[PDB]
Each structure stands twice: as structure tokens, then as C-alpha cells.
């Protein structure tokens, strides 16, 4: 699959707004993920013990991981599909060290779309959401292919 330049522009336009507050979006996205799919929280040994949203909002460790995740995703999106080099180390750590199934990448993709829809209605209309979904689908498809090559695929 391949996105058009127009689709990439819609993706990068809303991402530019996300970059105005990376830490804030990072918290919102991870917390959305953990509330919608509690099982994903078990993968984060640092704060698997958090019980409530209030505790999650106060966690500096969660906020830092959110920034790290979004910054890595932003770098990938900015490559507009030419992200082979960026995906290699990410695929290896998440497949071999963290053991993150593709299902969880789908879950976080859903959280990203939910938060952008909530915080940026003016720049996340139907066409923009479709472009973002297409970009995330491409990311998941390529990461899944790498998982397979690495011996994980799951
Ligand atoms: C948007 C997709 C994601 C991106 C771009 C991303 C990016 C990153 C980055 C850059 C790191 C630090 C370097 C590394 O270990 O590779 C990291 C660590 C990690 N990621 Fe992801 N990640 C994503 C999704 C997920 C998901 C869905 C989970 C599991 C629910 C997850 C769990 C972890 C864990 C457990 C760590 C290690 C944290 C620690 O113990 O310090 N990641 N991720």
C-alpha cells in the first residue's frame, strides 16, 4: 500500500499540532490505551501496578514513555513511507524484548485516533482521519513483516 502526497500532508498537518504538546498527547494516548485494554498495562513493568487514572496521570514514568513512543512514531511518519531504517530497531525490541503482539499495536493505533479526534476536531475531519488510519495501517503492516523475519510474527 502507498499513501499519496495529499494523504501524507493531512497526516503531518495534524501531527504538527500534536507536537505543540508531546508530553500531554503521550499521557492521553497511553491512558486511553490502558483504560480501553487493561491487559496492555501488564507489559510495562515500571508501572504495571497503577490502579487508577489519577495514578496514571501523576506518573512521571508513564509520561516519559509516552514522549519516547510518540517521538519515535513522529520520526517514522515524517519519512512518509521510507521508514525501513527506523523500523528495524523498533521491531526488534518490541518483538524480542518487550513481546508486543500486533494486536496491541492495533489497540494503540485506536487510542491515537481517539485522542486526535477529541483534541483536534478542526484538523481531524473524515479525510484526515482516513489518511492517519492509512498511515498507521502501513506502519503496522511493515512492522508485522519485520516481526516475521525476526522470528516472532504475532
Ligand atoms: C506507536 C507504536 C509504538 C512506538 C512508536 C513505540 C516506541 C517505543 C520506543 C522508542 C521505546 C524505547 C526503545 C525501545 O525499547 O525500543 C519503547 C519501549 C517500550 N515499548 Fe513501545 N512503542 C509503541 C507501542 C508499544 C505498545 C503498544 C506497547 C505495549 C502495550 C509497547 C511497550 C513498550 C515497552 C514495554 C517498552 C519498554 C519500556 C521500559 O521498560 O523502559 N510499545 N517503545
DSSP symbols for 28-53? HHHHHHHHH-GGGGGG-TTTTT--SH
Does the beta carbon of 143 sit less than 6 angstroms from any atom of ligand 1?
no
Burial (CB count within 10 angstroms: exposed 0-12, middle 13-18, buried 19+), residue 73: buried
Residue 104 near residue 40 (C-beta atoms within 8 A): yes
Q: Which CATH number fits the domain that encloses residue 117? A: 1.10.490.10
Q: Give the span between the Cα atoms of 132 and 127, in whole angstroms.
A: 9
- As a whole number of angstroms, the distance between CA 106 and CA 12 comes to 20
Task: Count other C-beta atoms under 10 Å from residue 130's C-beta.
Answer: 12
Q: Is 70 in the pocket of ligand 1 (CB under 6 A)?
A: no
What is the position in ligand 1's atom list of the atom closest to the CA of 73?
Answer: 5
Supply the angle between the helices 22-36 and 102-119 in degrees, to the nearest 10.
120
Q: How far apart are CA 8 and CA 109, in angstroms?
A: 17
Domain that holds residue 129: 1-154
* Beta carbon of 47 within 6 Å of any ligand 1 atom: no
Query: Is the C-beta atom of 44 inside 6 A of ligand 1?
Result: yes
Burial (CB count within 10 angstroms: exposed 0-12, middle 13-18, buried 19+), residue 32: buried
> Solving technique for this entry?
X-ray
Resolution, expressed in angstroms to one decimal:
1.7
Helix (H, G, I), strand (E, B) or coil at 92: helix
Give the angle 32-133-139 at the CA atoms, nearest 5°: 95
How many structural domains are present in the chain?
1
Name residues whose C-beta falls within 8 Å of residue 118's C-beta, 6 or more positions apart in sequence: 28
For residue 40, give the nearest of 114, 90, 103 by alpha carbon: 103
Tell how far the Cα of 43 is from the centroid of ligand 1, in angstroms: 9
**Which protein residue's CA is at the shortest distance from atom 6 of ligand 1?**
69
- 35-61 burial, b if ≥16 CB within 10 A, otherwise e? eebeebbeebeebeebeeeeebeebee
Query: Ligand 1 atom closest to Cα of 90?
Result: 16
Please count the CA atoms within 13 angstroms of the CA of 139 that sit on its side-chain side.
21
Closest C-alpha to 139, from 37, 33, 8: 8
In a 13 Å sphere around the CA of 146, the CA atoms on its Cβ side amount to 23
Ligand 1 centroid vs 98 CA: distance in angstroms? 8
Residue 107 CA: nearest ligand 1 atom is 27
Residue 137, exposed/middle/buried by CB under 10 A (0-12, 13-18, 19+)? Answer: middle
Return the number of other C-beta atoms located less than 10 Å from residue 62's C-beta.
Answer: 22
Amino acid at each position: 500500500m502507498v499513501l499519496s502526497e495529499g494523504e501524507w500532508q493531512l497526516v503531518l498537518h495534524v501531527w504538527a499540532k500534536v507536537e505543540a504538546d508531546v508530553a500531554g498527547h503521550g499521557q492521553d494516548i497511553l491512558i486511553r490505551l490502558f483504560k480501553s485494554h487493561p491487559e496492555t498495562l501488564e507489559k510495562f513493568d515500571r508501572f504495571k501496578h497503577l490502579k487508577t487514572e489519577a495514578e496514571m496521570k501523576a506518573s512521571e514514568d508513564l509520561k516519559k514513555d509516552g514522549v519516547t513512543a510518540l517521538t519515535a512514531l513522529g520520526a517514522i511518519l515524517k519519512k512518509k513511507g521510507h521508514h525501513e531504517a527506523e523500523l528495524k530497531p523498533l521491531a526488534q525490541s518490541h518483538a524480542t524484548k518487550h513481546k508486543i503482539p500486533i494486536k496491541y499495536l492495533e489497540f494503540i493505533s485506536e487510542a491515537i485516533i481517539h485522542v486526535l479526534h477529541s483534541r483536534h476536531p478542526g484538523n481531524f475531519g473524515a479525510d484526515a482521519q482516513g489518511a492517519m488510519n492509512k498511515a498507521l495501517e502501513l506502519f503496522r503492516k511493515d512492522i508485522a513483516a519485520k516481526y516475521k523475519e525476526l522470528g516472532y510474527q504475532g
